[PDB]
């Protein structure tokens, strides 16, 4: 009774846990009450309970600091009880741990402990380890003496002492600066999926021994370098406690014949002896490339050796093998057969939200100035991966150190804590780092949950509603579709002039549905045809299936018809190798996988009619140039971020810019915004955009869609009636 499952917390605070209300009522405790936590090896912790809408009823959410003190790991269970008899302390003695007091001196109490405890009212217990972050260092402290016992709340009027040599870490506790799950920024969904696959086999091996179910024995992670493939594999081992063995392709292959096979076998034998264990094989495509792509006897032998060692995992109890590759189809297909590596997770590239999370993670210890805006950085760092974002944070820290601290400190090993903590990193230091760094993954496809909302689209009121009926209704009201024998549509094709919002429509529905948006462009479909690599069609649809829920957007759907000649071509049809594979993958996709396909074309008259048959992109929506009322909405929507002067007549502009697309109206607003900003900056060497700024912007703005292009689109739309 009163037992709760240990899981991660959103709140990072060293004394806060979160429960779901039904457990707070059964435990007879209220929001803000102090509770005691009973873990393993006669170890306890004291904390305050809050609540949120994310914790499940059976779980208790806590951070790493609390789990370390209780000597528990994610997936374990602890007892919780209220303790309303908690009172304030009088005197406590807190000392740092030697593991973190390396290269730092000075008055650690005034720099760390006093800001940490002063007006903080934190519950503490004798033996509690907690981490205080600042000055670009993470220093952990232990409570060694308290007048009240075993626990008390530290009030601002209590006496806190800190005298004595740093404490050597005990073998029953781990360093709080070790890699864990809270060091992984983007790809949180992928980490959650892996946790479900791995944490239980390793944390509770007794359940798999007794219950007739098979654990995963091999997980393949893939994505560009620098995205966290090795960080996840190590973080999982550190959190579950399994021994981590490191293998990499090129090192094993650099050995002589017979040595490469022996070394690979030894790693597996050591994992069994140290089970539970995780074997991580990096650059899997280098150690075990496709045999149909190899020539040498050693190349075929090392693949066979890995295949037998993977199969031997039925006898090697509690050993899970993880592997990392750049491309899921660059490894011998035998490795992905039932057993062996029967699970895989698409790590990919962090999106704008993930990039911000990574920047926040690698600034935990950094003191940032008020002018620092990490969201602005995350939006500028397109094509960057975690390896690049970490570099940006460290480089910004170094520049702040060289500007200030090198005028204070000597070329030595030890720096005063006060000097380090007095340093703040400004936005200029981050912008400098951005000029020095270069994205390592700029061309690879990035999957993101878009931030486009319905309020971002001017006009098209009926199309926005239509998409909700096409995408949300089949899963929000499935009983009505069954009742009337309706087959939900699998996708819709948009056609019309460019720059009218086709992209926003696909993103906006993905946004409200909280679905991943996958952008496929014409050049990808064109490359597949000419390079005779149509197998990449399966990769696209497989990404959608693994990214589900998602919206898979195929731009420039006409690119295939054009490649066949478009306006003229030969005497045949539009069918070809690439579209044949696309149609096959669509037909085999189930609507219950929460994958919706949206297409777009600027030449609908040449689209292979096959794509418009039932089961494919059977629905057709015309997106014309915005009309008078829509153009006004577009202009006003773009200006929501900047005050507009009363002398600006946006309705007049809409009445004049009759041939302008939504893309062209955006340039007008954005150009007028830039002009107003320039004047504002110059005034200090203004509060709103003036009519003069719009009139000047109109001197450069032009319509992108000609009159003849409009007639072509209108005549086609009329032809379809």
């Amino acid at each position: 009774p009163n037992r709760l499952i240990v899981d991660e917390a959103i709140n990072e605070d060293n004394s806060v846990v979160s429960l779901s209300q039904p457990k707070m009522d059964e435990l007879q405790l209220f929001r803000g009450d102090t509770v005691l936590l009973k873990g393993k090896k006669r170890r306890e912790a004291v904390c305050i309970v809050l609540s949120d809408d994310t914790c499940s009823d059976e779980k208790i959410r806590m951070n790493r600091v609390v789990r370390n003190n209780l000597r528990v790991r994610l997936g374990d269970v602890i007892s919780i009880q209220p303790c309303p008899d908690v009172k304030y302390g009088k005197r406590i003695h807190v000392l740092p741990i030697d593991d973190t007091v390396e290269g730092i001196t000075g008055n650690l109490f005034e720099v760390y402990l006093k800001p940490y405890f002063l007006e903080a009212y934190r519950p503490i217990r004798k033996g509690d380890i907690f981490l205080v972050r600042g000055g670009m260092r993470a220093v952990e402290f232990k409570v060694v003496e308290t007048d009240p016992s075993p626990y008390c709340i530290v009030a601002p009027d209590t006496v806190i002492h800190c005298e004595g040599e740093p404490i050597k870490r005990e073998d029953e506790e781990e360093s709080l600066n070790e890699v864990g799950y809270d060091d992984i920024g983007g790809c949180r969904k992928q980490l959650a999926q892996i946790k479900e696959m791995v944490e239980l086999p390793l944390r509770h091996p007794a359940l798999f021994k007794a219950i007739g179910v098979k654990p995963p024995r091999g997980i393949l992670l893939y994505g560009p370098p620098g995205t966290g493939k090795t960080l996840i594999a190590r973080a999982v081992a550190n959190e579950t406690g399994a021994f981590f063995f490191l293998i990499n392709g090129p090192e094993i292959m650099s050995k002589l014949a017979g040595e490469s096979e022996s070394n690979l076998r030894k790693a597996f034998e050591e994992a069994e002896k140290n089970a539970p264990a995780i074997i991580f094989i990096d650059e899997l495509d280098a150690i075990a490339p496709k045999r149909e792509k190899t020539h040498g006897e050693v190349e075929r032998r090392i693949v066979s050796q890995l295949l037998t060692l993977m199969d031997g995992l039925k006898q090697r109890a509690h050993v899970i093998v993880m592997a990392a590759t750049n491309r899921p189809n660059s490894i011998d297909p035998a490795l992905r057969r039932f057993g062996r590596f029967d699970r895989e997770v698409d790590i990919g590239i962090p999106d704008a939200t993930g990039r911000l999370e990574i920047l926040q993670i690698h600034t935990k210890n950094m003191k940032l100035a008020d002018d620092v805006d990490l969201e602005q950085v995350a939006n500028e760092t397109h094509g960057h991966v975690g390896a690049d974002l970490a570099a940006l944070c460290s480089e910004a820290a170094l520049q702040a150190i060289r500007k200030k601290m090198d005028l204070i400190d000597l070329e030595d090993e030890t720096i005063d804590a006060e000097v380090m903590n007095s340093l703040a990193v400004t936005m200029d230091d981050f912008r400098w780092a951005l000029s020095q760094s270069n994205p390592s993954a700029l061309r690879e496809t990035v999957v993101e949950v878009p931030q486009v909302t319905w309020e971002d689209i001017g006009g098209l009121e009926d199309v926005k509603r239509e998409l909700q009926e096409l995408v949300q209704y089949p899963v929000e009201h499935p009983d009505k579709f069954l009742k009337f024998g309706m087959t939900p549509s699998k996708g819709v094709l948009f056609y019309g002039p460019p720059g009218c919002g086709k992209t926003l429509l696909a993103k906006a529905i993905a946004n409200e549905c909280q679905a991943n948006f996958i952008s496929i462009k014409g050049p990808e479909l064109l490359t597949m045809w000419f390079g005779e690599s149509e197998a990449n069609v399966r990769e696209i649809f497989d990404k959608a299936r693994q990214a589900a829920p998602c919206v898979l957007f195929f731009d420039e759907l006409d690119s295939i018809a054009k490649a066949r000649g478009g306006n003229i071509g030969d005497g045949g049809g539009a069918a070809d190798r690439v579209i044949n594979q696309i149609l096959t993958e669509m037909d085999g996709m189930s609507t219950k996988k929460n994958v919706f396909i949206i297409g777009a074309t600027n030449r609908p008259d040449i689209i292979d009619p096959a794509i418009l048959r039932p089961g494919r992109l059977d629905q057709l929506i015309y997106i014309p140039l915005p009309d008078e009322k829509s153009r006004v909405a577009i202009l006003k929507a773009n200006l929501r971020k900047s005050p507009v002067a009363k002398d600006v007549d946006l309705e007049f502009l809409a009445k004049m810019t009759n041939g302008f697309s939504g893309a062209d109206l955006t340039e007008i607003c954005q150009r007028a915004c830039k002009l107003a900003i320039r004047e504002s900056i110059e005034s200090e060497i203004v509060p709103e955009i003036r009519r003069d700024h719009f009139e000047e912007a109109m001197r450069f703005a032009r319509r992108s869609v000609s009159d003849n292009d409009i007639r072509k689109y209108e005549m086609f739309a009329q032809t379809l009636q």
Binding site: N11, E12, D13, S15, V16, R31, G32, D33, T34, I48, L50, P84, D85, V86, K87, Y88, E119, A120, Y121, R122, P123, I153, A155
Partner: peptide, 20 residues
């Protein structure tokens, strides 16, 4: 109890100032 509610108010202030 009352000392715990003051501890909760301090924890809520720290979490909101840093997260918001």
């Amino acid at each position: 109890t009352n000392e715990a509610q003051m501890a909760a108010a301090a924890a809520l202030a720290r979490l909101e100032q840093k997260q918001s």
